[PDB]
Amino acid sequence: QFFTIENTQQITLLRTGDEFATGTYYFDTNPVKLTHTWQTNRQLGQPPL
Amino acid sequence: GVGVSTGSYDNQTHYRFLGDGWVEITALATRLVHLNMPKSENYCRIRVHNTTDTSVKGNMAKDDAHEQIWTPWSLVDANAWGVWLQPSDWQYICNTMSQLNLVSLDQEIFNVVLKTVTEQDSGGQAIKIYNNDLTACMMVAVDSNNILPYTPAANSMETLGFYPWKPTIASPYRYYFCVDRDLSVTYENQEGTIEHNVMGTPKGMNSQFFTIENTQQITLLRTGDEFATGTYYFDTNPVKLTHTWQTNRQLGQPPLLSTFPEADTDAGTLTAQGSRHGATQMEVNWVSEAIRTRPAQVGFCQPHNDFEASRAGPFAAPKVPADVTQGMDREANGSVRYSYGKQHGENWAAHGPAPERYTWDETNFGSGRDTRDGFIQSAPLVVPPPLNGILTNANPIGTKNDIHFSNVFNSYGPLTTFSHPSPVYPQGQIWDKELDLEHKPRLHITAPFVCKNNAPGQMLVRLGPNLTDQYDPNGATLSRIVTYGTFFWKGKLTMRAKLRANTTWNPVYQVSVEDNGNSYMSVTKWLPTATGNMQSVPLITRPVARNTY
DNA sequence: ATCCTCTATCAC
DNA sequence: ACACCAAAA
DNA sequence: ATCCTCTATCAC
DNA sequence: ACACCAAAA
DNA sequence: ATCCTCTATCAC
DNA sequence: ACACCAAAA
DNA sequence: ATCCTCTATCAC
DNA sequence: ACACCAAAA
Ligand SMILES: [Ca+2]
Ligand SMILES: [Ca+2]
Numbered sequence: 001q002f003f004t005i006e007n008t009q010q011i012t013l014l015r016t017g018d019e020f021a022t023g024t025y026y027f028d029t030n031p032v033k034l035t036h037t038w039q040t041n042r043q044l045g046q047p048p049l
Numbered sequence: 050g051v052g053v054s055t056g057s058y059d060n061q062t063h064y065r066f067l068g069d070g071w072v073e074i075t076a077l078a079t080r081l082v083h084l085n086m087p088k089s090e091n092y093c094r095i096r097v098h099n100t101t102d103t104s105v106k107g108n109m110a111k112d113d114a115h116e117q118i119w120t121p122w123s124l125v126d127a128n129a130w131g132v133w134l135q136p137s138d139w140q141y142i143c144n145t146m147s148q149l150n151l152v153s154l155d156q157e158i159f160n161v162v163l164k165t166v167t168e169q170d171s172g173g174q175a176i177k178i179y180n181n182d183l184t185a186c187m188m189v190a191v192d193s194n195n196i197l198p199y200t201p202a203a204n205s206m207e208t209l210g211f212y213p214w215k216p217t218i219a220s221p222y223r224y225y226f227c228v229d230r231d232l233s234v235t236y237e238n239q240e241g242t243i244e245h246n247v248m249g250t251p252k253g254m255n256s257q258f259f260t261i262e263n264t265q266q267i268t269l270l271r272t273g274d275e276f277a278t279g280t281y282y283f284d285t286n287p288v289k290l291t292h293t294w295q296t297n298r299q300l301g302q303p304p305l306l307s308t309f310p311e312a313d314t315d316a317g318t319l320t321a322q323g324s325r326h327g328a329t330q331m332e333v334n335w336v337s338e339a340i341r342t343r344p345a346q347v348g349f350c351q352p353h354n355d356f357e358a359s360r361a362g363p364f365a366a367p368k369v370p371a372d373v374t375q376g377m378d379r380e381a382n383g384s385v386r387y388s389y390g391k392q393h394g395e396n397w398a399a400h401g402p403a404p405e406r407y408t409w410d411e412t413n414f415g416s417g418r419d420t421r422d423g424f425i426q427s428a429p430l431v432v433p434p435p436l437n438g439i440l441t442n443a444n445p446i447g448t449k450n451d452i453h454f455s456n457v458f459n460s461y462g463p464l465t466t467f468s469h470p471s472p473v474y475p476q477g478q479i480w481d482k483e484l485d486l487e488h489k490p491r492l493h494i495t496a497p498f499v500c501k502n503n504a505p506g507q508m509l510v511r512l513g514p515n516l517t518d519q520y521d522p523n524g525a526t527l528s529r530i531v532t533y534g535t536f537f538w539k540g541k542l543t544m545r546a547k548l549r550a551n552t553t554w555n556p557v558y559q560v561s562v563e564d565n566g567n568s569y570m571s572v573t574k575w576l577p578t579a580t581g582n583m584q585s586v587p588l589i590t591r592p593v594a595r596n597t598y
Numbered sequence: 599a600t601c602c603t604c605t606a607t608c609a610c
Numbered sequence: 611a612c613a614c615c616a617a618a619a
Numbered sequence: 620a621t622c623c624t625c626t627a628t629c630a631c
Numbered sequence: 632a633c634a635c636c637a638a639a640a
Numbered sequence: 641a642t643c644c645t646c647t648a649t650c651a652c
Numbered sequence: 653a654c655a656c657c658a659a660a661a
Numbered sequence: 662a663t664c665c666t667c668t669a670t671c672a673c
Numbered sequence: 674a675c676a677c678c679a680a681a682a
C-alpha cells in the first residue's frame with residue numbers, strides 16, 4: 001500500500017500574504033470521569049453483622 | 050389527633066390477564082416491623098480482624114479482615130422474592146409463564162407505635178411495665194439519589210419475613226470503609242512464619258464518610274403520621290423461564306444415516322468418517338461429531354478456586370453459574386450455597402443456632418463442564434494421542450499432584466456464548482444496582498435484575514432519641530428513656546409475564562407436589578405442624594424445556 | 599362498601 | 611338488585 | 620412523593 | 632414512564 | 641404469502 | 653421494510 | 662471550510 | 674452537530 005499526499009489530498013499554496021483555516025470538527029466521544037475508585041470484591045455491599 | 054389507623058393490611062397477589070396472553074402480576078406485601086433503640090448513639094468506625102483464624106498456615110480462605118462504619122440507622126430491604134409471592138404462586142408463574150420482568154415498586158409506612166418501658170416493682174421483685182409515649186417519634190428517609198453505598202440485605206439473609214402473620218425486624222445500616230489489608234500465602238504446616246498479616250490505617254485519598262443526616266431529608270413520624278414512597282419504575286431486562294439443553298454436540302444438522310434400525314433395540318449407523326462430507330478446523334481427513342464445526346461455543350472453562358487478591362485482601366473469584374454435569378463438579382460450575390434461617394426457611398422446629406443450608410445447581414444444561422473428560426490434544430492432530438501428546442486431568446501443573454490444567458484454564462472468548470442464570474424462589478435476590486465502573490460486567494450472579502439507569506433508593510429508619518431530664522453534652526456518656534416501636538410496611542411490586550405456548554407433543558416437566566413421602570416435593574413441607582411450624586424450600590424456576598437452535 | 603377461588607357485581 | 615357461574619352480568 | 624453523589628425525572 | 636448519565640431527559 | 645415457539649410482522 | 657423479542661412493532 | 666478510502670456531512 | 678459507515682445522514 002503506497003500513498004502520496006499529492007494523489008490523495010487538495011493541496012493549498014500559501015505565500016506570505018495567504019492564510020489557511022480548518023473547518024470545525026465535532027467530537028463524537030464518551031466523557032471521562034475524574035474520580036478514582038477503591039472498593040474491591042471484598043467491600044461490595046452488606047458488611048457482615 | 051390519634052386513635053385512627055393510617056393504612057391497611059393487604060398481602061395479596063393479583064393476576065391481571067390481558068390479550069395475546071400478556072399478564073400483569075401485582076404483588077402485595079404488608080408486614081409488621083419491630084424496632085428498638087440503636088445502641089451506639091453515633092457513628093462508629095469499627096474494625097474487624099480475625100487473627101484467631103488468619104494466623105494458621107493453611108487458613109486465609111477464612112479471612113474476615115475489613116473495617117465497616119456502623120450507622121445508628123436501620124435498613125428496610127424487601128429485595129427478596131420470598132417476601133412478595135406465595136409458594137404456590139411461584140409455582141404457577143413458573144409452570145405457566147415464559148418470561149418475567151420487573152415493572153414498578155411502591156412502598157408505604159404506617160400505623161406507628163411508640164412505647165417506653167419502665168422496669169419497676171423494686172418493692173416486691175423485678176417487673177416490667179409497658180406504655181406508649183405519644184410525643185415520641187420515628188424517623189424515615191430515602192436515599193433516592195443513592196448517595197450512600199448499596200447494601201443488599203439478601204447479601205446476608207437479613208431481609209424481611211417471608212411469613213406475613215409473623216412480625217419481623219430491620220437489618221442495621223453498615224458500610225465498608227477504606228483500609229488496605231494484606232495477607233501472605235501458606236499451606237497445612239509448611240515452614241517459616243506467615244511473613245506479614247497486616248491491617249492498616251485510613252488513607253487520605255479514599256476516605257469516605259457519610260451521614261444519613263447530611264445526605265437525606267428525614268421525616269418525623271409520630272403515631273398519627275404516615276409515610277409513603279414515590280413509585281419507582283424498573284428499567285430492566287426480562288428473565289426467561291425455561292432451561293436449555295443443546296450443547297456444541299447437538300447444534301443443527303445431525304449426520305446422515307446409512308443404516309436403519311431393525312427393532313426397537315439395535316441402533317443405526319452413519320457414513321465412513323473418512324468418506325463423509327462436512328467441514329472441520331483440524332487437519333485430519335475424516336469427520337466426527339466431536340471435531341465437527343459448530344456455530345459457537347456453548348458454556349466455557351472456568352478456573353477453579355481462583356482466589357485472587359488486591360489492596361483489600363484475598364477473595365474467591367465469582368463465576369457464571371452453569372450445570373454441574375454428570376461430573377458432579379459443583380465448585381467447578383459455580384453452583385451456590387445459601388445459609389438461610391427461620392425468618393427465611395429453616396423448619397421451624399429446628400433446634401440450635403445451626404443455620405439450614407441449600408446448594409443450587411443451575412439448570413442451563415449443555416453449558417456445564419465435566420472436568421474429568423476435558424482434555425487438550427496437541428499440534429497436528431493425531432488419531433489416538435501419544436502420551437506427551439495430550440495433557441489430561443491427571444497430569445499435574447507446577448509440581449502439585451491435584452492441581453491440573455482445569456484449575457487454571459480459561460475457555461472464554463468471542464465465540465463463547467451462554468445463558469443468564471435463574472432466580473431462586475425463597476431467599477433469592479430480585480434486583481440490584483450496577484457498578485459505577487466505566488466498563489460494566491455482562492451481568493451479576495448476585496441477582497437476576499440489574500437496573501440499567503438509577504436504582505431504588507434504600508429506605509432508612511431509626512427511632513428518635515427520647516431524652517431524660519438530665520443531659521450534659523460534654524457529659525461522658527448518658528441516659529435516655531428506654532423506648533422501642535413498631536409499624537406496618539406495605540409494598541407493591543408489579544410484574545409482567547406472558548403465557549408459554551404449547552408446541553411439542555410429548556408433555557413436559559412441571560413443578561408438582563407429592564403425597565406424604567420422602568420426596569423432595571412433599572406437600573407436608575409447605576404445611577403447618579401441630580404447633581404451627583413451617584419451612585420454605587427453594588423451588589425450581591424454569592421447569593420447561595426451551596430450544597436454543 | 600359482600601357476588602359464585604383475584605383484581606372485578608367486571609363484564610355495566 | 612340487574613349482575614342466576616361461566617360469558618359477553 | 621424514589622432517577623444514576625445536591626436542589627432537580629431538572630432539564631419537561 | 633418518557634426522563635437509558637452526562638446534556639439539552 | 642416467512643418475523644424471534646400459536647393464531648399474529650399482531651400489535652399496524 | 654417499519655415491525656431489532658418482549659410490549660404497546 | 663475536516664466526517665469513517667473520491668467527488669460528497671452527499672445523501673440534507 | 675444532525676449526518677453514529679453502509680444507506681436512503
Ligand atoms: Ca439528583
Ligand atoms: Ca369486591
Ligand SMILES: [Ca+2]
Pocket residue numbers: 193
Ligand atoms: Ca427528589
Ligand SMILES: [Ca+2]
Pocket residue numbers: none
Ligand atoms: Ca404467518
Ligand SMILES: [Ca+2]
Pocket residue numbers: none
Ligand atoms: Ca470535503
